[PDB]
Structure formats: C-alpha cells, structure tokens
Amino acid sequence: ALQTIINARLPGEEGLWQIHLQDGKISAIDAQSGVMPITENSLDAEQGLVIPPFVEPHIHLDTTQTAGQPNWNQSGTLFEGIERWAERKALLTHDDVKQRAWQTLKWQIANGIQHVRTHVDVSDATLTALKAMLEVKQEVAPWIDLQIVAFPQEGILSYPNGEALLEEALRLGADVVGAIPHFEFTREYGVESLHKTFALAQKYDRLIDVHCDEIDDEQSRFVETVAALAHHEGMGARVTASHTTAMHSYNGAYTSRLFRLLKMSGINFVANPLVNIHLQGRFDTYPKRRGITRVKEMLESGINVCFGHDSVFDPWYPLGTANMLQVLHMGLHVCQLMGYGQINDGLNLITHHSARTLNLQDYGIAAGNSANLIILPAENGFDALRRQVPVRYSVRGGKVIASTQPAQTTVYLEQPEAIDYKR
Amino acid sequence: ALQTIINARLPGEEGLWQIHLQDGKISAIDAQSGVMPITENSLDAEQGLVIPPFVEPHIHLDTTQTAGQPNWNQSGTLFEGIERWAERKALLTHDDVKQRAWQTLKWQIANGIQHVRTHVDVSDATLTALKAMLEVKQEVAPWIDLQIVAFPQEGILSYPNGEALLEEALRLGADVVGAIPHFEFTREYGVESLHKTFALAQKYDRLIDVHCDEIDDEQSRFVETVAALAHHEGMGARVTASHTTAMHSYNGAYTSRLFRLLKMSGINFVANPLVNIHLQGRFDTYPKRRGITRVKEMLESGINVCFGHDSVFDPWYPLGTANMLQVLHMGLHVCQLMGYGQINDGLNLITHHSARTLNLQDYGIAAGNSANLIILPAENGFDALRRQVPVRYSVRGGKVIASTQPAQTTVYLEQPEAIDYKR
Numbered sequence: 070a071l072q073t074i075i076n077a078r079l080p081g082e083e084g085l086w087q088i089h090l091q092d093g094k095i096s097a098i099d100a101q102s103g104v105m106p107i108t109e110n111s112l113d114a115e116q117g118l119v120i121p122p123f124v125e126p127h128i129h130l131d132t133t134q135t136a137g138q139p140n141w142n143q144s145g146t147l148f149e150g151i152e153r154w155a156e157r158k159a160l161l162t163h164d165d166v167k168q169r170a171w172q173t174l175k176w177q178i179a180n181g182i183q184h185v186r187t188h189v190d191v192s193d194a195t196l197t198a199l200k201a202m203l204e205v206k207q208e209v210a211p212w213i214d215l216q217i218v219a220f221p222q223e224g225i226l227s228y229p230n231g232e233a234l235l236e237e238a239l240r241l242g243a244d245v246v247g248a249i250p251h252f253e254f255t256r257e258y259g260v261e262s263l264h265k266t267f268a269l270a271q272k273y274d275r276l277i278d279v280h281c282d283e284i285d286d287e288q289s290r291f292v293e294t295v296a297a298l299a300h301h302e303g304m305g306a307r308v309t310a311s312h313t314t315a316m317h318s319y320n321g322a323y324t325s326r327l328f329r330l331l332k333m334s335g336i337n338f339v340a341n342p343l344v345n346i347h348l349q350g351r352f353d354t355y356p357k358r359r360g361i362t363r364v365k366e367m368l369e370s371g372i373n374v375c376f377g378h379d380s381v382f383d384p385w386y387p388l389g390t391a392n393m394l395q396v397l398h399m400g401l402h403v404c405q406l407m408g409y410g411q412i413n414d415g416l417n418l419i420t421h422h423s424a425r426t427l428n429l430q431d432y433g434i435a436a437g438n439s440a441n442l443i444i445l446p447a448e449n450g451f452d453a454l455r456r457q458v459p460v461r462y463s464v465r466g467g468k469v470i471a472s473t474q475p476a477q478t479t480v481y482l483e484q485p486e487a488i489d490y491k492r
Numbered sequence: 493a494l495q496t497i498i499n500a501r502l503p504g505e506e507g508l509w510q511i512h513l514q515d516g517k518i519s520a521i522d523a524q525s526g527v528m529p530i531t532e533n534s535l536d537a538e539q540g541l542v543i544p545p546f547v548e549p550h551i552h553l554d555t556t557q558t559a560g561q562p563n564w565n566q567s568g569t570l571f572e573g574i575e576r577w578a579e580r581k582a583l584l585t586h587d588d589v590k591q592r593a594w595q596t597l598k599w600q601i602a603n604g605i606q607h608v609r610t611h612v613d614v615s616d617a618t619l620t621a622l623k624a625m626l627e628v629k630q631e632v633a634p635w636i637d638l639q640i641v642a643f644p645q646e647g648i649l650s651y652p653n654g655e656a657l658l659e660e661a662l663r664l665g666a667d668v669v670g671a672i673p674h675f676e677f678t679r680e681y682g683v684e685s686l687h688k689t690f691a692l693a694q695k696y697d698r699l700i701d702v703h704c705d706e707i708d709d710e711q712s713r714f715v716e717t718v719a720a721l722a723h724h725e726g727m728g729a730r731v732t733a734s735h736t737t738a739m740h741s742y743n744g745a746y747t748s749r750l751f752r753l754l755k756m757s758g759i760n761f762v763a764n765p766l767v768n769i770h771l772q773g774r775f776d777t778y779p780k781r782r783g784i785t786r787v788k789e790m791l792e793s794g795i796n797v798c799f800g801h802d803s804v805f806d807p808w809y810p811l812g813t814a815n816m817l818q819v820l821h822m823g824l825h826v827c828q829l830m831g832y833g834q835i836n837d838g839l840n841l842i843t844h845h846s847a848r849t850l851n852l853q854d855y856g857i858a859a860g861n862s863a864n865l866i867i868l869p870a871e872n873g874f875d876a877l878r879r880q881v882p883v884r885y886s887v888r889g890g891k892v893i894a895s896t897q898p899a900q901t902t903v904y905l906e907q908p909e910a911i912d913y914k915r
C-alpha cells in the first residue's frame with residue numbers, strides 16, 4: 070500500500086511537501102528542501118498540486134441524463150424546467166434512476182470528486198427516485214460520500230401532502246431537509262414553509278439546504294428568514310441557502326443591511342454558475358443581467374460561499390461532464406473574480422468552502438485525517454484553472470481510485486514539438 | 493425682573509408687538525402702532541423677530557462628540573455608523589456620557605433651543621448612557637426640557653434581551669419608546685417589533701418615536717404599520733416616525749395611497765437634513781438620490797413634519813454646532829422648498845411643528861403660557877434664514893438665559909463702512 074505522497078505543492082504554501090500515510094490516514098506532513106526520489110510505495114506528485122478532494126455541493130442525480138425526455142425546455146427557464154421535469158418524473162422507475170445516477174457519479178469519481186450532495190425530488194407520493202438514491206448512496210460509498218437532500222420541488226404547502234412526504238423522506242434516511250419558498254403559491258406560504266423545514270431539521274437532527282430565491286425578483290427575500298431562523302436556533306453551520314440569485318437584483322442598501330445577518334448567522338451559500346447564467350436573465354430583453362448571487366461581496370465579507378454544477382444534461386442544463394474546474398471557470402468570469410489572486414484562490418470555492426457547506430468532519434490535508442486527496446498536474450490554482458487540467462490521481466483511504474494519463478499534443482514544425490500550453 | 497418685550501415682530505403678523513410678562517408667564521400681547529421707547533425692565537427686540545424657542549426633535553446626546561473614536565465611519569453609511577458606535581459603546585463610562593452630553597447641550601442653550609428629544613441607545617445590558625442621561629435631564633432642567641427616547645439601536649427582536657432592556661429603560665424613566673424596524677433581521681421581526689413598541693407605550697403611558705425606514709429600500713414600508721397602529725389606538729399625537737428616508741424611493745401610486753393613512757393617523761414626522769444628505773444615496777453611483785423624506789408633499793397635505801440635527805460630531809456626522817437655522821437651510825435646499833414663502837415659513841419646521849412632535853403643552857407666544865421665547869436680529873423668517881443670524885436673546889421663565897452680541901464687520905474703502913449683509 071502507498072506510504073507517501075512526495076514532491077507535492079500545497080495552496081498558499083511555498084516549496085515542496087511530503088505527505089506520510091499510515092493505516093488509511095495522513096500521519097504527518099513534512100516540508101522538503103528539494104525534489105525527493107521516487108521509490109516503491111511512494112506516489113510522486115511531480116511538483117503538481119495536492120489538495121483535498123473536489124466537492125459537488127449541489128447536483129440533481131435523480132434528473133441527470135434526462136434532457137429532452139419526453140420534451141425539451143424551450144424557454145430555458147426554471148419554471149418550464151420544472152414542468153418538463155414533472156413530465157419525466159411520471160415515467161420514473163427504480164432502475165432508471167439508479168443507472169443514470171451511477172453514470173454521472175462515475176464521471177464525478179473520474180473528476181476527483183469524493184463528496185456529493187444530491188437533491189432528490191420528494192414531491193412524489195411514490196418516492197421512486199428517493200428509494201433508488203438511498204441504494205445508490207450505499208453502493209457508491211467506497212468512492213463517494215453521498216448526501217441526499219429531500220427536495221420538495223413543487224413546494225411544501227403548495228403540493229398535496231407536501232409536508233407529510235418531506236417528513237417521510239427524512240424517516241427513510243434523507244440527510245438534509247430542502248425547501249423552495251419562491252415556488253410556493255404565496256409569500257406567506259414561503260415563510261411558513263421555512264418554519265416547517267427548520268422544525269423538521271431539529272426534530273430529526275438533519276442539515277438544511279434551501280433552493281432559495283432562485284428567481285430574478287427583487288422582492289424575493291426568503292434568504293433573510295433562512296438566516297434568521299438559523300441564528301435563532303444556533304445552527305448556522307448546518308444550514309445552506311442554494312442559489313439566492315434574486316440577490317443579484319436587490320438594491321444595495323437592503324443588501325448591506327442583510328449582510329450583517331448573513332455573517333452573524335454563519336449559514337452557507339451555494340452559487341451554480343453554469344445553470345445560473347443559463348436560467349437567469351431570461352425575462353430581460355437587453356441589457357440582460359448575469360443573475361449569479363453576490364459571490365465577490367460574500368468572499369470580501371468572510372461569508373462562506375461555494376460553487377455547484379447543479380445539473381448534468383437535464384431539464385435545467387443541456388451540457389456538462391460534472392467537472393468542477395469548469396464550473397469554477399464560469400463563476401470566475403461571470404462574477405468578475407478575475408484578479409490573479411482571486412483566480413488562484415478560486416480552488417477554495419470547489420474544495421474547502423464546499424466541505425464546510427456539507428458540514429464535513431474529515432476533510433483536508435492534515436495529520437489525523439483520512440488519506441483522501443487528489444493530485445492536479447499544475448503549479449497552483451491559477452495554472453490548474455487556466456489549463457483546465459484533469460485529475461492525475463485521486464486517492465481515497467490511501468488507495469488510488471482514479472487516474473488520468475494526460476493527453477499528448479504535438480505540432481510538426483521544422484521539427485516535432487510537444488505542446489503543454491504552459492509559460 | 494423683565495416686565496415687557498417691546499418692538500417685536502411676529503411671524504405671519506403685520507407691524508410691531510409688545511409682550512407683557514408677569515410671574516414668569518406671558519400675561520398679554522398687544523399691538524403697537526409705532527416704535528416704543530426702551531426703559532428699565534423692558535427687553536427691546538429692536539424690530540427683530542420674536543418666536544417661541546427653537547426645538548431639537550431628534551439628537552443623539554449619548555454619541556455626541558465621539559466621531560473617530562476608536563475608528564472613523566469610512567463609508568459614510570448608517571450601517572457602518574452603527575458598527576463604529578458599537579465599538580465606542582463598549583468604552584462608555586458614566587462621566588464620559590455626562591460630559592459630552594453637557595457640551596452639546598450648552599451649544600444648544602446658546603442657540604436658543606429650550607426643548608430637546610435625545611435618543612439613547614438601550615441595546616446595552618449595563619444601560620450606562622441611559623443612567624447618565626437621566627441625571628443630565630435633571631441637571632439641565634432650568635434651561636432645557638429634555639425628553640429621553642429608549643432607543644434599541646441594535647433591534648428589539650434581533651438583540652439579546654432587547655425587549656426586556658427596552659422595558660427596563662421605561663421603568664427607569666425614559667419618556668419615549670423607540671424602535672428600528674428596518675434594522676431587525678427580518679420584515680416579520682420589524683412588524684412584530686412595532687406591535688411590542690406600541691404595547692409598551694400604552695402600558696406605561698409614554699410617547700413613541702421610531703427610527704423608521706432609514707434606508708434607501710423601496711420595500712421598507714414600516715411607516716404604514718406605525719401609522720395604522722397609532723390610528724387603531726387613537727394616539728397619533730403621541731407618535732413620531734423619524735427619518736422615513738425610504739419614502740424618497742417609493743413609487744408615487746403607493747405613496748398617494750399611504751398619504752391618506754398618514755393624514756388620518758395624525759402621527760408626526762422628523763426629517764434630519766444634514767445627516768440624511770450624507771448617509772443616504774451611498775449605494776447609488778450616478779445619478780445619486782437625495783434621500784430625504786417627502787417633506788414638501790407632507791406640508792402640502794397638512795401632515796406635521798419638522799427637522800432635527802440628529803448627530804453632532806459622532807459616527808453618523810462629522811460636523812455641526814447644533815444650529816437649527818443651519819439644519820433648516822440644508823433642508824430647504826435639498827427638499828427644494830425655495831419659493832419665498834416656503835423659505836419664510838421655514839421657521840415652522842424648527843419651532844411649532846417640532847413642539848407638536850414632542851407633544852408639548854406649554855409652547856408658543858400666547859397669554860397664559862410660560863415666558864419662554866427667543867429674539868432673532870432679523871425682519872422675518874426669510875431674513876433670519878438667509879443671513880444665518882444668531883439668537884440675540886433667549887428668555888426662559890421671563891429671564892434671560894443666553895445672549896449673543898453680534899459680530900461687527902467693517903470694510904475699509906475710501907472710508908470705513910459697516911457691512912450687515914442686509915438689503
């Protein structure tokens with residue numbers, strides 16, 4: 070078994086490092102003063118970057134791989150997406166869900182993702198997808214720690230037996246309680262649905278992840294209730310507000326007032342760049358707003374924010390290979406986090422910040438932690454992002470679970486020349 | 493003791509008037525048909541304007557004279573101001589508060605102000621400033637009738653034990669119940685905080701003065717709850733909505749609907765020109781809104797509105813000499829009340845309208861009232877405002893408590909010439 074990772078670069082650190090492994094855990098981390106020789110039982114990072122695993126804080130594995138079935142989302146909006154999904158949800162089968170979820174999970178394993186939070190639509194009396202996903206969770210455990218959010222896609226108060234079905238999903242084992250206040254029939258149902266969500270999370274000791282204000286409506290302010298209830302219950306670390314795209318349209322004075330509460334509450338935020346740039350701004354003609362939440366300001370204020378892929382070939386997104394560096398690339402551009410340091414520090418948005426969002430207790434390159442880490446063939450975060458590098462090796466429990474032999478490009482000039490796009 | 497004020501001009505009246513004094517009160521007011529001779533026991537207004545005392549309806553004496561301690565409000569916003577104040581509040585001492593409050597009160601006495609309403613932050617378990625201010629109130633009584641507002645600066649529902657501390661402040665003697673709905677964590681807490689404020693005011697028979705919608709948020713409409721609760725309880729005269737700067741940003745249709753309720757409710761409004769022009773519009777780039785409430789429209793609709801200084805060298809305002817004519821000057825410009833009559837009638841915004849806001853029962857130049865009046869060396873309100881004249885004499889209980897010997901300016905041309913800036 071592997072005993073050491075050598076010649077590793079670490080974000081924010083100078084030089085090279087050696088990571089000693091023992092019994093599936095990291096036993097010690099020591100700085101090197103030069104390049105170490107390879108040897109049996111040593112995985113050579115070759116001066117590449119070593120980081121804890123990529124994380125997918127927000128994806129829909131029950132809907133993945135279904136775009137165009139039975140119809141396509143023509144308008145490219147959240148609302149038509151839900152209608153198209155409703156048509157597909159009526160055709161679900163146990164095996165159908167497991168096969169599609171596993172297809173995307175394999176792409177995630179290949180992409181160095183070892184932690185995934187999937188929402189599963191529980192606005193369905195049969196709970197077909199949830200039952201299938203609970204089995205997938207057990208099956209994929211050796212490679213990915215999968216969290217399941219009981220997501221009441223059609224509302225808690227606005228769907229028949231919505232609250233009972235949400236609770237049934239928790240009794241069956243869902244890890245996180247979801248909600249979607251802006252989709253409820255009225256603002257009052259939206260606020261009430263959040264009180265019910267928090268009560269269920271406290272009753273069952275579960276996390277919370279709300280699809281919150283995913284709409285270009287400057288009056289959609291459910292995020293303040295999510296943060297206030299979390300603060301009141303002293304449970305911010307266990308709470309996440311996904312999307313908050315309406316915040317892109319708020320006036321600045323209200324946003325400033327709100328930010329004090331967001332920071333005090335300690336709740337987490339997920340932005341989904343690939344899907345948000347596609348679904349938001351659809352009701353504008355020109356100019357057209359970007360529609361991503363206030364990521365730059367959250368980072369400046371010390372509010373935990375991270376990025377999710379959200380959808381992979383489904384009603385809300387026709388593309389994707391479940392690649393977090395690609396999600397990061399889109400977010401940095403749309404949010405204008407284009408300074409050198411902002412880009413270089415971008416990896417935090419798909420690693421550490423996402424681990425905090427999932428309330429992970431065993432994450433990071435530190436002594437005592439499980440030996441879960443990935444190696445990128447790049448010098449730092451900036452380089453990895455610019456070149457959209459693959460994951461050279463993914464290690465879990467001290468064993469290699471995925472590897473990518475890099476592509477080899479040659480140009481035939483006066484003589485052949487290898488091209489690696491580096492400077 | 494003084495027996496008469498002679499050669500006095502009165503706002504809205506033609507000619508000169510004599511005000512007879514007896515036992516510290518005004519015994520009679522009689523018109524003169526010409527200039528009266530001076531004599532012992534007669535204070536000669538010298539054809540200057542005689543008015544009841546200036547009033548300061550909104551100031552923070554617990555924070556006065558603390559700008560830059562320990563840090564400056566860099567952004568010039570309400571929100572950073574509260575954060576900077578929090579840092580200073582942690583350093584308060586009894587003597588510190590009394591000394592600074594008295595420094596500003598002396599400037600007010602010098603400026604002919606005999607009625608002052610100070611807010612005091614009670615989001616503090618030690619209630620340090622409140623205890624100090626209650627002593628200052630007794631000490632300054634011979635010169636100024638000071639009202640104290642128990643102001644829960646960090647919220648009633650959003651601060652630990654906020655409601656209990658607010659009530660404790662009333663049990664200790666605060667004259668007015670305050671609130672700050674737009675600073676509460678949620679809109680629901682904002683509305684609920686107002687029900688609690690009104691319940692306390694009725695339980696203790698106290699006045700109400702809410703820091704209401706002091707934010708450039710077109711959705712901040714707490715003023716309608718303040719007015720509706722006042723109307724329901726039949727207590728409009730005892731209620732004040734301070735700031736209402738959000739009203740500057742409301743659409744006109746909602747404002748028109750709202751105005752019917754504002755008039756029916758009978759509540760009072762305070763605008764704070766010097767601070768509002770500084771703190772509002774801070775989230776705009778260009779164009780930049782003024783941010784003062786709808787003073788002109790309130791006056792046209794017969795809704796009582798008046799002006800306060802708000803802050804004198806503190807986290808929210810780096811300037812000031814506690815001068816009401818200066819506050820008035822700024823308000824007339826920013827609110828575009830620049831017609832001759834509007835400027836001339838401007839004195840009402842810092843005298844009679846403010847007295848109504850404080851629910852004063854002994855105010856005005858009328859027989860039977862206490863002999864509390866000031867003399868301005870000017871022909872009318874327009875002249876006093878244009879030349880920013882000092883208070884020549886301030887009389888309280890029939891005795892002179894302040895006087896200003898005017899500056900003397902001379903230009904040396906072919907011959908020396910006195911300049912008084914008059915036409």
Ligand SMILES: O=C1NC=C(F)[C@H](O)N1
Pocket residue numbers: 129147222249280283344379380385
């Ligand atoms: O409500 C939603 N359902 C599915 C999505 F992909 C999007 O995150 N929002």
Ligand SMILES: O=C1NC=C(F)[C@H](O)N1
Pocket residue numbers: 552570645672703706767802803808
């Ligand atoms: O909430 C507030 N505190 C202090 C001020 F000066 C301003 O009136 N508003």
Ligand SMILES: [Fe+3]
Pocket residue numbers: 127128129188280379
């Ligand atoms: Fe989603």
Ligand SMILES: [Fe+3]
Pocket residue numbers: 550551552611703802
């Ligand atoms: Fe104030």
